[PDB]
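Annotators were shown the component list below and the corresponding predicted structure, then asked to write short factual statements about the assembly.
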Amino acid sequence: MKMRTEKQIYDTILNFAKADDRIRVVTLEGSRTNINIIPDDFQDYDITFFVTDMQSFINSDEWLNVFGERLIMQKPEDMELFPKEEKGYSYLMLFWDGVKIDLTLLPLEVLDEYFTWDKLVKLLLDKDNRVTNIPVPTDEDYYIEHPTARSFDDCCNEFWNTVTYVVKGLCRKEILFAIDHLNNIVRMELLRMISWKVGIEQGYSFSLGKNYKFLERYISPELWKKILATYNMGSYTEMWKSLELCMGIFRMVSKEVAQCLNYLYPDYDKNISNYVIRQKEKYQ
Amino acid sequence: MKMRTEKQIYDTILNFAKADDRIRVVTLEGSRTNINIIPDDFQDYDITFFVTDMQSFINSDEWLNVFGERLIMQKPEDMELFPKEEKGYSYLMLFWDGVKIDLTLLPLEVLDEYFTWDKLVKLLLDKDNRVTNIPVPTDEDYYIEHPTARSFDDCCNEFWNTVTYVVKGLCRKEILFAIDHLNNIVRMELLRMISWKVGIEQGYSFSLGKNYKFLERYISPELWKKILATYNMGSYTEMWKSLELCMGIFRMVSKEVAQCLNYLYPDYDKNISNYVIRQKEKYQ
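Structure shown to annotators:
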């Protein structure tokens, strides 16, 4: 059940922008610019306004009422607990009907370099014709990268080195330390190596999506099940199993990448695998 | 079974530094400077050398052989896959006997501001008496922070807003997106709120450690079990359970913090909890 159509939402946004002297350019960002994303009910409206007077917007929130009644909103460049990590000033809003609008205000001066930030951008309005070469959105910066012999070694090095930090956390009875290093680093390097395997098998012309979220489409159900099994980490016993499964998958996938691209298979696996076994025995 | 004593390791490091004209200051960093850490077999030796000629060290690795035979080493400021994220040039080494040395080379000029970077620092050698006010190591920058009414609201805002991103990932059958947002953000804000609860209950004069790794000492076994149960995430069914458990813990703990510090309890819980229930039903 829709309470508003997509055309009604775009009209609310653009009619507001057209009427306001301060707003000179409007762009669209994110998955709605991406012809390779299947449309669904969760696609945010990522809208950017380029404006002549920033402070006149920040002074009061009343002008936002045109977008509808809100369930929640965040102003991430205006919080105390969190520092600014994007330029400009944004409003992340979830509305009563489940629609989401992430609205960014940027000073007009930033238009000089804005288009270098991301290629998934579509120009919606340009009152003064500032944009002389109009960009065509593309997700090409998100395709799988081909490794080099050096970056392959680097990935193996970071995987196997950080494995030793999971071991330290488990042997010290500091499970949260072990979990964070597995989540933030060890399994991320495993997923990177898997992305290189996908590139070898299927090519370099498509994206696996943010957080590798499209990976399931491009790997065996057998390998997908194992990957998901590594995310059961709520005990020391489960964490040793997850870590050992992660190591087994990494051996199999990095060996395939090395043999397909004619790289040396490094000694990290042999040396750290023995280290893991010895440490586990010492504390068992 | 030790193959080398701590005194032998320190002697290997300092005798090397004393003999070398290029090295003028040596410091120790990390948990070995921290009198509140219980010593164990996994404490790295975090050593920093301040040197007159950086490039003469980087040219060749032979000089590292004095530290022993290595199982693995990383040179993180000299990789292709990973950009530099620390100043200077470091060597992360794990040795044949399980000893770990993380050795950082820094130019002498950086000594002007180095001591502002971290307070868990101990001066080991200063050939020219460059350090006139000698620092005393302390972990005080790692104690629990007292929230303000604004930062309390900010934490609640980020928790409940990001809950909606876990919902989106689960409803889209994009579980890796949902898992990453729960791991990187949702549960981190839960752990932050729990740290504030600990501060109220037990005070502001101690550290919960990196990755909150000492948290188990300061919360009920009952609450610890629930926290660990949230880390079972290897299926859509498990992820809905984890998310709902995370929300329940957050309600209980943020309510206690608000009532103890006389903050307003925000409407995020009510509004987003209903949103979650509706979305789960819509896709079930």
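Statements collected:
1. The domain at 6-141 of chain A is CATH 3.30.460.10 (Beta Polymerase; domain 2).
2. Helices of chain A lie at 6-19, 55-58, 111-114, 149-171, 175-202, 221-229, 236-261, 268-283.
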